[PDB]
Structure formats: structure tokens, C-alpha cells
Symmetry: D2
Subunit: 363 residues, 4 copies
């Protein structure tokens, strides 16, 4: 019942300012923080050898795209390796990002581990020495971080244990980040795997996010200096029932309104298994949803910003600009989407929508 | 991990519609739900015998005030006795309230009880047979309810037990209400008693409200079909440090933004120990606070609507109009305040731009 | 982190002394606390009208059995009505019980109520005015109380909510009892309904009991002044797999060893749907289990003490001694069983072998 | 509500067997797991350079003490460095320990870290890669582990956060250990620092241990395959009120009886700031306490086994035998103490047919 402030007013201002820069109007996040193991599958899909130089070149391709991406990209999440790589002109990648108006982010979790006594559920590791890592990352140009927890919808999952433990470890990570001037992006990802329907995803998302914010409260987290990186509320990948984008938008915004305090500066959706176009259309629908939304609703996209660029590249240096063009097209699309101004087939305000239509009490 | 819906879409729509009517723009709540024991000391202060007829006459005085109060009063909380009393013309008081555009409320708790093993802390009783009581009250014209929990700021309070238990019983009460078509007002009152400062009240309010909304989540409460009735965030009564109304406002709105999901339809402040004018000025400042506020911010006032009326009445029938005039004046003032339009002058403002120097990172 | 003792050393001694008397070696509890609704249909089973007089006569039959029962019966749980009834000789039933060396107990819960948003789960009501009720019951000769919570094993049950809420209300009930010199018997009954196996029941019993004792800790309950009244660990009623009494004993004792602190004075098993003979044999096996058991392991039997007596009586005054004889046979058997000294031989009636199981039909 | 067994029966039997060997009658644990940083001040106290060789020689001195220690020492906790060192004759230290009948243990935490927003409270780190470390340690001869959490009694401490978080991380550590055939010793140390009295230590110890065992339950920990390493319940170092060894014993055993399930195989007390003789006398009083104690109550002593030996050694190879003799004397003393047969003076005793005491409800 007694306060022992975790942060000074100055520390709070720093975190809040960073958080707001990342999700400024029209801006979102490029999630480029795939580990060597994670990106292996991406490079194999284009017959490209998973070498440090090819990883460097691919990240260079994204980070040095032309200035059209600048008002689209408020932040870039990097993997450790990339944080210490340089572009062809000798500039460290953090400097490249900053010169284009982006905030530099660093993924700091050390992956998932199995929870014994559960049906294949996990928590996430990475807290050991995290404070010192954050202090160093801060010095080396990073101002925010990312940590991924993974939950699965199944017959008996997510379990009480999995929800409580993942919420708790997210809070520890967030606490340590804020002590070191790093804005934590809290990523409690509920996988879309399975044949569950939209209502079930909405229910599980509501319960998971309630647990997350109670844990953040218990650990004295300054919400204004955080971002949330959740799944959209969608049917399961194998669900037999089909839904519209407006229904997905309504389920998502309702789940967030029921759980995320207004003090949270922004929500930066992960794209999950969604295609590039699907992720953009859904984000647009979310931003056109006629409910009050007291936080930025924008993107933290990996595959949904990268899929076409990677394919266009094909591992060939001669395809640089063609690949970059595909990335710029998705950056532009999603920048419009996070303002509710994205039209898929067109561009000239040729997308009129629905009002006075549909109950929000079915959600 | 599996939903077993507490409410149908139709039940949800009913609750949401009621909650929104209560806190519609310009409207707040008259809290007239004092028990015989509670109002006794109020009648003694004006030398009036605490009889059923004098209580009836007093409640009639408030409820039958002229039509100027109609746009000011969205709801009226009654004590059980009053719910079944009639005006002089034979009209049930609920009908009187409804004819003036008000929603009828009923207090359903059975008072506080001591928590053993604590330093004088309490929980609140009243769950037994509550469902049947709610069904009866609904039939007899009530559409919302009130339940008061009380917490104290002290050397060791509020304790973990007190916070958890009061949050839990509020959730049970809210669950039972919603099963019977009654909108629950959740009232976790943190008393202003003591010499603690503004920061301490804000800290405790934040921890209490986080506990409250986690419990409501655990018990499957439909937030859109609820209201919150909290203390404003103020220094303790015996605090020597002085604060402006803008500081009280910032602390209050900050605490709510950090804990209350946007889905909550409205916040209806209790006036506590504040004077009539103090309570209007603070509510107005709260509504002028330049942060995003995704819920109605209005009043649920007892003393702050009734004090001058009670005094002007003095127990004398000939002072009816004078007493009513005092009540009407406070209803008008607070109707303005809950829109941020209260000026100490007779409805005359437009001096709305002269705010500059206060950090929200100091809160 | 600061103690505010709920109880004085004198209060602790009184409660500890009472608890130990109830479960003194060789002794158990007659659970005769069936409400009018509960006792009604068994009275129907022998064509007897459910009148106050017939209920009184039946209770007299049990309570005034000959002195062979005295060393078997440490306590008797009464329903409110019976607490204020008198034997034919004018003696209040509490006086009758005490004169035979028994402690008088009173059931104080007010039945189960549905938890909204669950699959047919309940919590239990009865806290309102419980303190005053306990003080009065204490004056009128009761020294312990009973409160029944009910949980069910199913695909999604018991849920996190049901476990937490039932554990919490048990703790509130225990707290209030101990403030008034009443030893609370904590009864978290996990129903045997369903086709689950022994392992599943053991798992659920362990999770439920861990929740119960954490809640009792949080609410500052003095464990030495309590008793526990749980289900034995058994397969579900409809389980096809067969188990020995030694396996039932091992699962039961293991579940308790993993969850019940040694400070708990005694465990008084409910018989659930077991026959008179099965309940005795299992209790015997439990006491013979070769693991360390730092609490009394005895009976709190209703039907399993009463079935043969009720049938032998048949509602006929002339069959008094015959009926009493059946009850005495069962008290003696279970007195031996709670010492691990019961061997059946020559020979219990067919009434003592028939399943006493009725499905829990809120359905 | 559904079991997904963390362990097979075979895995359980292995863990239980190990746990029981460590705390077999008359046996305790030598805690020799000081890090380089931790042992530094003790080597300085005898003017000895903190080098790997001097550390090796000192550990060798302890581990190769003569065979009188064999029936006294059921286990030895090593620091990582020491697990991979060899005696002069080339035998790995794990082989030395095992040949004398001891189980080899390994400390696996990575020290305390500050909890932001608290008054100087900590949690403990070390989960990252812990599974792989445990598998490696198992292969390299360790069968149990130790993990130290630290809590402090102060005006506002231990806080709800600190208790919750330390209990949770202890449970994670325990889970990972048991997946790898390693018995976890759970060490929630409440420091003796401060001027608090015996009752306060007892209260905090009860609350901490209740939290620890709820967390172990939530994480599916197999208690029979664990040990507990708690503080004894004592007044704070600066407390002016004086207590007898019998009062310390009663408070300690009462606290454990109220919180530690019988299934826990043993309690191995840390000696904290107690002197060699004090720690032995208190352990003896604990084992003579006339309450039922369903777990082994023995020692896990660092300083209380090493102080005189370290002093006699003085960093001088020439003092090997003298130093070993001091260690052997404390090993003998504590073996008697954990059997309740230690007399604090020289040679003459054994006339005890003791223990069934007057006081009990003052605690």
C-alpha cells in the first residue's frame, strides 16, 4: 500500500516520448528480428545460403529502401547480429534506421521453453543478465525492445499456469527494460493454429490480456512507456466457419477495449500467418471500426512487410531495387491502413463503408 | 480456456442501454440511498425526527423537484424503503423518477463487516439471496444497483487480503446483478481519512482498481453493462500539503487511464467528504483534463447534491420550495461540470483556453 | 508483512481443544444436518410424511441410541431446526448430545448458487449475518460448524474460477466462525459424478485442496482450530475401471499428504455415494495406509451411518430399538475403521451394501 | 482440471530415492557452494589470496575429511568450479563425495537482482538454459541442486510482489530440475537482518512458505522429490527481546507445521548468521520439539560447518589436520542434533526421555 517509485519523472518522460515516436500517426514497425534459425526457412525458400553476408545484405535491402518508407516506419526491430552490422557505405544499421526517422528496437528474449505438466505449452526465457544487456543495447542505439511469449488455443489450452507464467515473465522483462531507458513491447502471441472459431479467439484473447495487465500492475510497470504487440482476434487457421474483415475488426477492437487500459500508448499488431494483403485489410478495418479506441492501432509486421520483397530479391544482388519496391509498397499500404485510409484495389477514396449497421453485443 | 457465455446478446444490449442512459451527456446520479441508520444523523443535524414519514417527505422533496433537473439526472439510487414509497399524489417514487427521465437504482449491499486478522479493515456482505432480490427489484422498477466496499489508507492498509476480498465480492455482486437485468455500479471507496498525500492516494487507487478489473474479468463480467463509482484521487483530509483542482484532476484521470478498460461505460464519482462546490469544481476539472478519457466522467453524489437542501428544509414543510431550489442549483452545477462547462457564474463561460504548465510525467 | 493477530492464545486454545475432542481416537462425526428439503425424499422412501414431528422423532432415534455409541461419536452436526428441538424427556437435543460425550455442530451455509459464465458450476452462500448467527449458536450449545462447497469433475470443470471462488468463500466462513469460538469444518466436496478414473480424481483433489489451504492462509485461519471434510479419492461413479480399497486408500492419503498442512487437526471424510459397508472398509484401508499421516483420519458420515437405521425404522414407533440397533452397528464399525481395526464378518445387512449414490441433478 | 503428467513413475521414484538418501536419519548437508565473490571475504579474513588453487585446496580439505563424517553427511552442495576440480590424487571431487556415501549437489542460481518499484527487494535469476545445465550436471555426477531466493523483513517488506515473484521463480527452477532427474532444494531465505521479534519472523515465514507451496502446486512440482531449505524462525539480529532455544524451536516447528505438506521429504535448515554452536543447539531443540513433524528436520549448513575449520586452516597447507578436525567436530555435532541427541558441552549425557510440552497456543 506504499509507493517506492520505480521511475523518476525524467525516466517516465523518456519512455513515453520513445513509445509515442514509434506509433506516431501513419507509422508502424518493421519486425526484422528473425534469428539465424528463424530466417533459415525464409532464405531456403528462395534457394539462398544462410550466411552472415546474405543476412546482412537482406537486412540492408530493407533498411536502406528509399525515403518513401520514412513516414511509414516509426520503428524497426532488429536481431542482435544485425544491430552490430553495417551497410555497404560503412554506416551501422542503427544509424541507417535513425537517419530515416526510425526508432531502433532489439529483440531480447532467448526463445520459448516447455512448461512441464502441460499439453505442449511454453513460457519464454531470457531474463538472465537482461539489465546489463539492455544498458549496452541502449548505448549502442536501441530505444525499445521486444519479447515474445506464445500461447496456443487447444482442447485444454491456454492453461491457468501458462497464462499466469507468461504474463509474469512479460512483466519481469518490461520492468528491467524500463530501468534502462528501453521501451518494452509486450508480445503475448496467441497462435492462430487450430479449428477454433472467432468467438473462442476473442474469449482467450480477453482472458490473456487481462492477465497481462494485472501482472504489469503487480510489477509496477509504467504503461505509457510500453507498447502491446498482440495477435488480431481471428478465427483459427483451420476454422470451418468463415468471417468478414469487419467481424474480425469488431472482435479485435472489442477484446482490446475490454482489457487494455487507455494509458497504453499503442497497439502494434503482429501479422501471424496472414498474407500481406490480408494483414493490411484487417488493420484498415480495425481502424475504421466505429468504437472508441484510445490507443494507436498500427502494425508490427514481419512477413506481411517482407514476403514479396524476399521473393523479388531471390538472393540475387541484381534484384535489389525490385525487392525494395515490394517492401515500399507494403509499407505504404500499411501506413494508410493504420489511419483507416487503405483501399486494396484502388487508392482514390473508392471504399465507402458501413454505419448504423451491426450490433456490437454479439461480441 | 472455453467460453460458457454468461449473457445472451439481448441481455448484453439491455444492460449496455441502461448503463448508457444513466451517464448520457450532462447527466449524473443522485445518491439518495441512505439507510435509516445512515440518514438518522443527517436528520438530527436539522432537529427532525427520524420517522418513515419524514424520510418519505424528504425523498419526495428531492425526487419531485421541478423539470429543470430532468436533463441533469440520469439515475437515482434509492434505499429499499424508498423504492416502495409513494408521492403525495399516490405515484410510486420509481414512476416519479422515470417520468422525469431518470433510471431507478437500488442499493443492495448489507453493509461492511470486519476482516479478522487485519488492522481494522472490512469487506462487505449482502450476497445471500441477492439474485432473488434483484429479480424482485427489477420487477418493481429498478434497472441498476449499487454496492459499497470500503478501503482505508494507513500504515499497513489497504492490505493484500482486503484488496483481493473486496474486489472478489464486488465481482460476485456484479455477476448476480447482470443475470437479472440489473446494471451493477461497482463502488470501491478508498476513504480520504488520514494525512497521506496526493501521490499516495493515486498509488493506492491504481492498485485497487487493477484488482477490481482483474476480478471482474475472472468472474466474466460484461464491462459495457457496468459503471464504476470511485473516490476522486485527493490528498488525505489531514494532509498539510495543498493541491490545485488541476492537480486533483490530473491524478484522478491518470489513475483511471492506467486501470479502467475503455469498455467501461462510465465513471460516476462519489463526493466523499467534499463540499458541494468543491465536488462540482473538481468534477469540472476532471472533465477539462487534457488527457484522453474513453468513458463518461460524471457524478454519483449524495451530500454534494443534498447538503444545502437538507439545511434549507430544516424539517419544516413551509420550506419545501427553498429546499428544492438548493437541490436544483447543485443538479444544474454538476450537469455542467460533467461536461467541463461549469463556471462559478450562472451558466456563463467561453474562457476555455489558458492551460499550459503541468507535466503528466510527474504523475 | 505485519501480523494483526486474529486470535488470542486463549481463543486459539479453545478452538484447538474443541477440534481435538471431535476427532479424538476412535471417534467420528454423525452428519445429521439435512435440511427439510434434503430429508424430505428419504422420508418418502419409507412412506413417512415430512413433518416437524417426524423429523424430530427420527433425529431423537439417532441421538438417543444406547451408550455403546458414546466412544464412537465425537461430534454431531445438526440442522438449525433440530438444534432447537427437544427429546421426549424435555431435554434439548444439544444437551442430549453433550450428555453422551459429543460435541454439538451446526450447519451454517445457505446452499449452492450458480456461477454465471461456467458450465453448471456453483459457489455457496451464507455469509450474511453469519457472525451474529455463530454467536447465538455458540450460546445455544454449538461448538463447531459445517459449510458445504460443491465441485464437479468434467471436461472443463472444476474451472479456475470455481476453485478460487469456493476456496475464498470457505475461508471467509472459517474466519467468521473462529471469531465466535466455533471450529469450522471446511467441506470442499468434489462430487463422484462422472466416468473419470482414480488418477483424475486424485489430480483434481490435489489442486482443489492446495487452493483451499492457500485461501485459508490468505485469510489468516488458525488451522489447528479447523477440520477438513473432503471426498475420499475414488474413481467416478460411472468409471468402468476397477480399483482395490488399498488403491483408493493410497490415492486418498497421497492427495492429502501433498496438500494438507500437519497443523490441521483432523480430516473427517464424507461418504459421498458409498454404501455403509464400503465407506467403512475404505476408511479402514485409509487408516492402514503405510504412509505418515499427521492428522486424525475419521468419518463425517450422514447416509453411511443412517441407511440401515432409516429402513429398519420404516416410520413406525414400534421399530425404534431395531432402527437404533442398526445405527449403533454402523457407529461401532466406523469407530474401528478410524483406528484401522475394522474387519467385516458375520455380517452386515443387504441395506449396508447398496450404493447410496444419487446423481447431482441441477440438470 | 486435466492432468498431463510432468513425470513418469520411474522419474518420480528416482527423485524420491535421491531426496530420501540426502536426509536419511542422522545426515545433513554441507553447503560448500560459495562463488568466487562469495568466498572472497572469508579468505580475506584469514589473509589468503582468492585463487582457484587455494579454493580447490580448501574444498579438498573439507571433502577429504576422515571417515567419521560419512554417517553425518548425506549431501554436499558444490559451486560450479568445484564440481569439475580434482583432489591431489586425481580423483574428481564428485567421486570423493560419493565414495564417502554423500550425494553430490550443485548450486544453479545466478544470484539476486533488484525488483524495481520495491524498497530494496530482490528476486533471483538463473533460469536461462537451466535445463541443459541440469542435464550436463546430472551426467557429471550431481543428483540435486540449490537455488537461493532472499526476502527481508522491514517496514514494508516482504511485499506482495516479492513473495509472489520469488515463489514463482522457485517453482520454475524446481520444475526444470525435476525434468532432468535433479532433486531441487527450494531455498526461500528470510534474512535475520533487523530488530523484528520472534512472532514477526514466524508470521512472515508462514506467509512466505504458504506462497512457496501454492506456487509449487501451480507448477506441478512433485514434493516427495524436493527438499526445503528455510531459515529457522528467530528474532532479528538487532532484536532486544531475548528468547530460549525451546522458543525458537517451537516457533520454527509451528511455522513449518502450518505450511509444509507432509509429502515434502525433508527440511534442511540454512544456518544464516548463527554461530556453529548456536545452529547445532537450535537444530537439536527443533528435533526435541514435542509436536508431530512428518519430515526430516536437519541441516544444510555453510558457515555453521566451516567457521572453525577455515580459521584453523589459515590458508596454510601445514594446518590441514587441525582444520579438518574442526569440521569433523561440527559434522558430528549436527548429526546428533538432527537426532535430538546433542548436548552443548563435552562428554556425558544421553538421559533424555523427553518432549511432550506445556505451551503451544502462544505461537
Amino acid at each position: 500500500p506504499h509507493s517506492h517509485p520505480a521511475l523518476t519523472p525524467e525516466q517516465k518522460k523518456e519512455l513515453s516520448d520513445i513509445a509515442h515516436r514509434i506509433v506516431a500517426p501513419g507509422k508502424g514497425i518493421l519486425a526484422a528480428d528473425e534469428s539465424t534459425g528463424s530466417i533459415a526457412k525464409r532464405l531456403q525458400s528462395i534457394g539462398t545460403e544462410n550466411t552472415e553476408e546474405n543476412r546482412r545484405f537482406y537486412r540492408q535491402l530493407l533498411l536502406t529502401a528509399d525515403d518513401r518508407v520514412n513516414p511509414c516506419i516509426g520503428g524497426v526491430i532488429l536481431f542482435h547480429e544485425t544491430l552490430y552490422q553495417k551497410a555497404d557505405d560503412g554506416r551501422p544499421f542503427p544509424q541507417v534506421i535513425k537517419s530515416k526517422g526510425g526508432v531502433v528496437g532489439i529483440k531480447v528474449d532467448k526463445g520459448v521453453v516447455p512448461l512441464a505438466g502441460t499439453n505442449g505449452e511454453t513460457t519464454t526465457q531470457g531474463l538472465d543478465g537482461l539489465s546489463e544487456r539492455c544498458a549496452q543495447y541502449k548505448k549502442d542505439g536501441a530505444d525499445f525492445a521486444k519479447w515474445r511469449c506464445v500461447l496456443k488455443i487447444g482442447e485444454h489450452t491456454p492453461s491457468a499456469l501458462a497464462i499466469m507464467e507468461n504474463a509474469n515473465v512479460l512483466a519481469r522483462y518490461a520492468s528491467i527494460c524500463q530501468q534502462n531507458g528501453i521501451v518494452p513491447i509486450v508480445e503475448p502471441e496467441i497462435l492462430p493454429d487450430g479449428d477454433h472459431d472467432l468467438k473462442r479467439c476473442q474469449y482467450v484473447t480477453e482472458k490473456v490480456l487481462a492477465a497481462v495487465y494485472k501482472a504489469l500492475s503487480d510489477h509496477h510497470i509504467y504503461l505509457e512507456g510500453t507498447l502491446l504487440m498482440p495477435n488480431m482476434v481471428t478465427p483459427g487457421h483451420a476454422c470451418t466457419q468463415k468471417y468478414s474483415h469487419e467481424e474480425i475488426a469488431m472482435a479485435t477492437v472489442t477484446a482490446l477495449r475490454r482489457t487494455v487500459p487507455p494509458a497504453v500508448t499503442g497497439v502494434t499488431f503482429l501479422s501471424g500467418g496472414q498474407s500481406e494483403e490480408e494483414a493490411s485489410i484487417n488493420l484498415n478495418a480495425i481502424n475504421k471500426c466505429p468504437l472508441l479506441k484510445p490507443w494507436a492501432l498500427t502494425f508490427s509486421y514481419g512477413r506481411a512487410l517482407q514476403a514479396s520483397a524476399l521473393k523479388a530479391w531471390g538472393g540475387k544482388k541484381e534484384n535489389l531495387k525490385a525487392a525494395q519496391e515490394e517492401y515500399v509498397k507494403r509499407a505504404l499500404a500499411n501506413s494508410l491502413a493504420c489511419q483507416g485510409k487503405y483501399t486494396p484495389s484502388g487508392q482514390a477514396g473508392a471504399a465507402a463503408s458501413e454505419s448504423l449497421f451491426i450490433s456490437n453485443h454479439a461480441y
